[PDB]
């Protein structure tokens, strides 16, 4: 840079593009007469720093009277009309004539090398080549000096052109996009609930992902791809592609570099490259995961993320699917369980007839890329779609008429929406109960216009307030008016809702097959004090590791079970206490017979209009728990004001009311006994407490995360309550787990 005022003695480059380390540019395509080799031209073409084409091979094809000209505007027609990305002599060159290179099969040799002008390179030669290929010892002959060059860091900014592969697998799945866009050549059957990309400007879909754009996350830990993300996008989505088009074992960068097909040394960058971004993408749990196992000797990260030390706590979804990720990666990993069973708010009662049961969760609430629907496959279990039909019964006896609860519907969600409409104006500070909001617009909606309702008109509203009661998981006048649905903004899982038939604790029991878990030690004390953390038993049993992720209940959070050492933060318990530990309870009866059938007609569940507001939440709704409709199990809940109102009755006088409730839905018919039944008492279950958070009156969905920050890199936090996105569900659990395996093991 100085000293260089003398055009005279400034430096000779022999390629015009600036910082080529080439100074012997020789040409590639011997295409025309008078190819320069490696002898002068008036101009040498960049195409990688390896790379290059001389100026007679550039007129070869751009020139019309040329008699490559053909072959190139055959080419150059074809391009603009599939892509998007511009026609160039030297894209052309990139597409069309650049040799293909392959790596040697053999584990003695796995030198690159080039192929010949006219093999064409398909997915079975690159999975078995050899050296010398269409007698002596071609596996001595030295690797063309080029192929070190690559793997150097500067080299792929000294690319020209993004590689676009050819013949990719994620080619069906995009055919909505421009091959380009998408990191494939313009010139060119799975699992139902497995849309895996979203298709181009749809929003809304969990879980899908950009084909075309990079995420946060993925240019935070790729950064070199911020100029062009396309040799990036182009192999995630591959690697996606096949994960898909096979779940049930585990996706690794050999079955992937067969179908990685470019012409050029680029190639080279690419089998490269995939390999980090494949390990990247088993980290967030993206691919191999689920309830695959592996089990024994062969792990799914390099062994440098290996002996790091885990300490769990909570045998629950979020416990479980950390420690499968972490037991998976190879990390060392130790699972404490306080009850004596693992499952937490999962746990199926089997003992009834033919049928199963859910205690805890049995509903899945979106299909469409949700983890449970993955795992649903790998395990080969089947999950019935709850149908539209859900007329709600009367006491005794009536079904309401549709148009009432069609009328009554308009008029509950136009309160929400004056609700809603208030909000935007209101800050933490001026949260109102939604329950007091919702009864003082109602109040000056009749107040105002004239307009009174019937009695029955009235219990059908209340109908709807009650089933709010059951999503917030307490009684109205606890939830934030300001950010009850906070939730719901975000995008969320699409598709079918299905009961899961053989339960949520069959994919439970598998992710926990063969792991070190801890019964009946419960924790009381996490010390990460010092250098390493250690937890010890209510009993006095000491455990000790690297870092521990603590997966516990929002209730048992709240009151201190656990003592922190040094203790939490001031702003993380203001938000433990932000939220609310909601409760509903379940019922499940066993008749000796279908009693409902003639009535509900095949229906999946019937609703129960109630008679007072004050018992709202009194078995607002029947499920029918066999979908083959051929056993005879009903199962209802109890939510709001109602959970409280049965915490002082035993058993046996709550599975009274609900006959009664049963016999004056059914009021001109016979009903028989149950032979078998349970009541949940979660509320009281001294480990757990509760059935899912919700924003308490004041709180703010941002509490979720706050609550799942870990603590200087040791202390991490899951659970159905750390993760804002997807809160409450059994689903939302398991990708939290997901989400803190990926940072421990990072
Ligand atoms: C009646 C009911 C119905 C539900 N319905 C559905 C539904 O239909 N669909 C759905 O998706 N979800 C449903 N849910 C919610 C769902 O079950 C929870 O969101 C999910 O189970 C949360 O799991 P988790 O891993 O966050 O914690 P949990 O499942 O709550 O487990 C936490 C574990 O922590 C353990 N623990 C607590 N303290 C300690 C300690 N000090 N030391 C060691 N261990 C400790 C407990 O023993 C427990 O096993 C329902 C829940 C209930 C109760
Ligand atoms: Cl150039
Ligand atoms: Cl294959
Ligand atoms: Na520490
Ligand atoms: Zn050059
Ligand atoms: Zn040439
Ligand atoms: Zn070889």
Not at 497 to 520: F, N
Request: hydrophobic fraction near 35%; aromatic fraction near 10%.
């Amino acid at each position: 840079p100085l000293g260089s005022e003398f055009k005279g003695l400034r430096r000779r480059r022999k390629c015009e593009k600036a910082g080529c380390t080439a100074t012997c540019p020789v040409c590639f395509a011997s295409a025309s007469e008078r190819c320069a080799k490696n002898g002068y031209t008036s101009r040498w073409y960049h195409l990688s720093c390896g790379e290059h084409f001389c100026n007679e091979c550039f007129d070869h094809y751009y020139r019309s009277h040329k008699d490559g000209y053909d072959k190139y505007t055959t080419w150059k027609k074809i391009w603009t009309s599939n892509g998007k990305t511009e026609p160039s002599p030297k894209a052309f060159m990139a597409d069309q004539q650049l040799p293909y290179w392959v790596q040697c099969t053999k584990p003695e040799c796995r030198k690159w090398r080039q192929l010949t002008k006219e093999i064409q390179l398909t997915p079975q030669i690159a999975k078995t080549y050899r050296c010398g290929m269409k007698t002596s010892d071609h596996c001595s002959l030295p690797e063309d000096l080029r192929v070190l060059e690559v793997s150097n860091h500067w080299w792929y900014s000294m690319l020209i052109l993004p590689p676009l592969l050819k013949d990719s697998v994620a080619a069906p799945l995009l055919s909505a996009y421009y091959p380009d866009c998408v990191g494939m050549s313009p010139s060119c059957g799975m699992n139902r609930y497995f849309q895996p990309f979203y298709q181009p400007n749809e929003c809304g879909k969990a879980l899908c992902v950009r084909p075309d754009v990079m995420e946060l996350d993925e240019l935070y830990e790729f950064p070199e791809y911020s100029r062009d993300p396309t040799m990036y996008l182009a192999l995630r989505n591959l690697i996606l592609a096949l994960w898909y088009t096979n779940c049930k074992e585990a996706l690794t960068p050999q079955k992937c570099i067969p179908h990685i097909i470019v012409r050029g040394l680029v190639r080279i960058r690419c089998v490269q490259e995939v390999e980090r971004i494949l390990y990247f993408m088993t980290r967030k749990g993206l691919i191999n995961t689920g309830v695959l196992s592996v089990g024994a000797d062969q792990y799914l990260l390099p062994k440098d993320y290996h002996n790091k030390s885990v300490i769990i706590i909570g045998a629950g979804p979020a416990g479980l699917a950390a420690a499968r990720q972490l037991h998976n990666f190879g990390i060392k990993v130790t699972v404490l369980e306080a009850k004596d069973r693992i499952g937490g708010r999962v746990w199926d009662d089997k003992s009834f007839k033919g049928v199963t049961v859910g205690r805890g969760a049995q509903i899945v609430n979106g299909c469409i890329n949700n983890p449970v629907a993955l795992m649903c496959e790998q395990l080969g279990i089947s999950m019935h779609k709850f149908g539209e039909r859900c007329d709600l019964i009367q006491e005794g006896g009536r079904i309401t008429d549709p148009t009432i609860d069609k009328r009554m519907d308009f008029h509950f969600n136009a309160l929400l929406d004056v609700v809603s409409e208030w909000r935007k104006d209101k800050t933490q500070l001026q949260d109102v109960p939604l329950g007091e909001k919702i009864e003082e617009i109602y109040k000056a909606f009749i107040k105002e216009s004239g307009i009174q309702f019937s009695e029955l008109e009235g219990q059908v509203l209340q109908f709807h307030l009650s089933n709010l009661e059951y999503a917030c998981g307490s009684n109205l006048h606890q939830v934030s008016a300001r950010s009850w649905d906070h939730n719901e903004f975000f995008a969320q899982f699409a598709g079918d809702h299905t009961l899961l038939t053989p339960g949520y604790s069959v994919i439970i029991e598998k992710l926990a097959e063969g792991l070190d878990i801890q019964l009946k030690s419960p924790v009381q004390c996490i010390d990460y004090s010092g250098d390493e953390v250690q937890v010890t038993t209510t009993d006095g049993t000491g455990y000790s590791a690297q870092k521990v992720l603590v997966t516990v209940p929002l209730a048992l959070l709240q009151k201190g079970a656990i003592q922190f050492n040094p203790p939490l933060s001031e702003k993380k318990m203001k938000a433990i206490n932000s939220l609310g530990a909601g409760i509903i309870e379940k019922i499940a009866l066993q008749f000796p017979y279908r009693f409902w059938d003639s009535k509900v007609q095949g229906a999946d569940f019937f609703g129960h209009v109630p008679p007072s507001a004050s018992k709202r939440g009194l078995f607002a709704v029947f499920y029918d728990m066999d979908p083959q409709k051929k056993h005879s199990v009903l199962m209802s809940v109890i939510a709001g004001e109602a959970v409280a109102s049965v915490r002082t009755l035993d058993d046996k006088q709550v599975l009274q009311q609900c006959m009664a409730t049963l016999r004056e839905l059914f009021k001109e018919q016979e009903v028989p006994d149950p032979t078998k039944y349970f009541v949940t008492r979660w509320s009281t279950d001294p480990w757990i407490q509760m059935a899912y958070s919700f924003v308490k009156t004041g709180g703010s969905g941002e509490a979720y995360d706050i609550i799942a920050e870990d603590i200087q890199g040791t202390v991490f936090f899951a659970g159905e309550a750390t993760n804002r996105h997807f809160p409450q569900t059994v689903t939302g659990a398991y990708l939290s787990g997901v989400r803190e395996a990926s940072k421990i093991a990072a």
